[PDB]
Amino acid sequence: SGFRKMAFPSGKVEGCMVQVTCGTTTLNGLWLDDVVYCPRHVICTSEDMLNPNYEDLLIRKSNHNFLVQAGNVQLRVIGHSMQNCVLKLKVDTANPKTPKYKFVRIQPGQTFSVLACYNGSPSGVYQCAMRPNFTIKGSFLNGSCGSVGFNIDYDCVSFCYMHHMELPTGVHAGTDLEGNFYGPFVDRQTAQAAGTDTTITVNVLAWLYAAVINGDRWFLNRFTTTLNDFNLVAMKYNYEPLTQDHVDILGPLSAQTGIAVLDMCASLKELLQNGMNGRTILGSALLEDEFTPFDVVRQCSGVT
């Protein structure tokens, strides 16, 4: 019993974290097979970052300008290419610690673990979601760029995020591992505001299901609702609209707890309209939206 905000073990990803230096700039890189992936702004000064032309800046760079250090041993760079907003550095040695891995572009609402790294040395690990405004609420200082987001399916590391920007509001933007940014963000120090940070309605329902299971049941009510009725309340409270797809995904938890998805929606509705009244659900004073249905099932069944 007990429900915690829980990250995948980072061991498999600690073994891929290297230091990438280009001139004065030193951020983190991901060494998989004979390729090291890092943010392309490694080639930039903080002065370049106001309006960089990466194609032009890159012409001036050579294989030998990119210094890749894995622990206290340097890797020889035998090729470099720009894909979108990441560089791919081909090294002469394949990473002996390369796990099974895929690159996956995640959807908003999806969760992943982040290994925070400075100088290719991991500092800590926490769990995150891709917000519906394509930001993430991270913890990232200077030198934390090229830190990666991942999920783990038994032995296979699916990489979903590489860290790039901190918006003036202190929320975080970044790319998949094909270097395509999540949302309309660009590796440029410009006016970049995030849209409405809406609550991930399905994840809140999952997390309510997790509470019931883990003993916290005060918030169960006699009422039910419809999708259309519940959504009018969701809209008002800047909650993501709930679809039949979201309901289907909550079926397992529905079945396990024998509480209908729409009964639990009616529970949430009342929590939105009436608040918590100074009470707590799973040691939290607000409605947590960074646990997927899949995250609850996993933690409540104990998958390794």
64 is catalytic: no
145 forms part of the interface with ligand T6V (CB under 6 A): yes
Decide if residue 20 touches ligand T6V (CB under 6 A): no
For a copy of itself, the closer of residues 109 and 143 by Cβ is 143
Residue 15 binds: one of ligand T6V, a copy of itself, none (C-beta under 5 to 8 A by kind): a copy of itself
User: Does the footprint of ligand T6V cover residue 175 (CB under 6 A)?
Assistant: no
CB of 267 to a copy of itself, least distance (A): 18
Among 41, 172, 246, 269, binds a copy of itself (CB under 8 A): 172
Q: Looking at 52, 120, 143, 149, which residue binds ligand T6V (CB under 6 A)?
A: 143
Q: Does 46 bind a copy of itself (CB under 8 A)?
A: no
Q: Which stretch binds ligand T6V (CB under 6 A): 109-117, 128-136, 138-146, 197-205?
A: 138-146
> Is residue 143 involved in binding a copy of itself (CB under 8 A)?
yes
Can you tell me whether residue 207 is helix, strand or coil? helix
192 binds, among a copy of itself, ligand T6V, none (CB under 5 to 8 A by kind): none
**Site map (CB under 6 A) of ligand T6V, residues 24-53, x = contact:** -xxx-------------xx-x-x--x----
CA neighbours closer than 13 Å in the CB half-sphere of residue 232: 5
What is the DSSP track for 86-141?
Answer: EEEEEESS--TTPPSEEE--PPTT-EEEEEEEETTEEEEEEEEE--TTS-B-----
**Which among 22, 38, 41, 128 is annotated as catalytic?**
41
Q: Which does 224 bind (CB under 5 to 8 A by kind): ligand T6V, a copy of itself, none?
A: none
Cα–Cα nearest to 263, from 219, 211, 210: 219
Cβ 129 to a copy of itself shortest distance, Å: 12
- Tell me the C-alpha to C-alpha distance, in Å, between residue 210 and each of 9, 207, 251, 293: 21, 5, 13, 9
> Is 145 designated active site?
yes
Binding status of residue 60 toward a copy of itself by CB under 8 A: no
Spatial distance between the Cα atoms of 133 and 142, rounded to a whole number of angstroms = 23
Where are any strands of DSSP class E within 167-200?
172-175
Buried b (16+ CB within 10 A) or exposed e, 88-117: bbebeeebeebbebeebebebbbbbbbbbb
b vs e for 63-80, b when ≥16 Cβ sit within 10 Å of the residue's Cβ?
eeebebbbeeeebebeeb
Which residues contact ligand T6V (rule: CB under 6 A)?
25-27, 41-42, 44, 46, 49, 142-145
